[PDB]
Homo-oligomer: A and B are copies of this chain.
Amino acid sequence: MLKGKDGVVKNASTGDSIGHLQSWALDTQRDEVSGWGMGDDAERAFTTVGRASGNFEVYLDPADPSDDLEPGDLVDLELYPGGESTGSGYRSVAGALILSTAESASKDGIPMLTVNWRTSGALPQKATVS
């Protein structure tokens, strides 16, 4: 039961935490192929290839690297669900490609940026921090 208020996402290449973040997400998926024949009760299935994606939301920032990331950029992202405390697992994705960014605001609220990423050529690797 990680606390979830201490999560840190950092760009591995430039070594900077992203900024005041509202939320993070990650997903991993593998496609399915099903086949059945005449006279068969159940359908057999197998998994072929894998992709991963995710998104993070942060208050709009002109004083942090939050500002720098751009659609099309290739970045290395290390995400710490429970923080960087020793023995806390980190999900590291290499070659993350940033597909899209979205900025929004309202009269009564703080401006927000949402970044969506996909993985290219690699799959997220779990590891445990020192």
| Number of copies of this kind of chain in the complex | 6
B25 and A103 within 8 A (CB):
yes
- Does the CB pair A41–B46 fall under 8 Å? no
A31: chain B residues at CB < 8 Å are: 99
Q: Can you list 16 A-B contacts (CB < 8 A)?
A: A2-B59, A4-B111, A22-B107, A23-B104, A23-B107, A27-B102, A29-B100, A30-B100, A42-B119, A43-B121, A46-B97, A47-B99, A60-B82, A62-B88, A62-B128, A81-B103
- C-alpha spacing A82/B67, complex, angstroms: 14
B-binding residues in A (CB < 8 A): 1-5, 7, 20-32, 34, 36, 40-47, 49-51, 59-62, 67, 70-72, 81-82, 87-89, 91, 97, 99-111, 118-123, 126, 128
